[PDB]
Design a protein around this ligand. Sequence first.
Ligand code: OCD
Length: 221
Amino acid sequence: IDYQSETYKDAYSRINAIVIEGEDEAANNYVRLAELMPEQSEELASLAKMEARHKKGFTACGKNLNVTPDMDFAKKFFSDLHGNFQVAAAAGNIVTCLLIQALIIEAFAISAYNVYIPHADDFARKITENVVKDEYLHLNFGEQWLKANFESAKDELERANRENLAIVWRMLDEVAGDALVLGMEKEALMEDFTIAYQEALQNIGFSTRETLRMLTAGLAA
Ligand SMILES: CCCCCCCCCCCCCCCCCC=O
């Protein structure tokens, strides 16, 4: 990997932006959730501070490589998912909101960061390994809530899944090519995501059988 060829910097500027916008949208989303579940607003506000901290770390990984992040691509990358969260939030569909942010985006984020790490430069390797440390040193707030609320949330979780997984698989298809310039094999991303997300869904209470039915519902569309 030439960390400064135009190929690379070009790929990095979208990927860095995706990560930066990703953390920004998490921060706002967890703040917004703090409103919808004021019972748990203390944890959620702490989660949001944390995401906002990672925003700064990932901002520095661009600058170190002399890359301006392409924020408009990243904002347009997130757009449908952001939409479904907004709509689901605007109507108090907290179950849907939590699937999106606490399970889906999170599996995807963690898997990506983990697949990036072996192939990242020294500075960004450090920053990402810390983000990962933190982003699973604190516990998956949204997952424990969905597990404790499972019987009630079960049917909405299935609807949320079909609508939202579908999109996240569209999202990986669009940056596969860019991720590969960063040394990230599309397959490794798919596996890690699928494992994390499958095991999050089983943990909150679906059978294996049910999880598979759910993951397949994502493929198409
Ligand atoms: C410094 C650049 C780090 C590169 C990581 C590779 C990212 C691959 C593309 C998909 C990433 C989706 C990130 C979403 C992060 C926001 C959610 C955080 O909890």
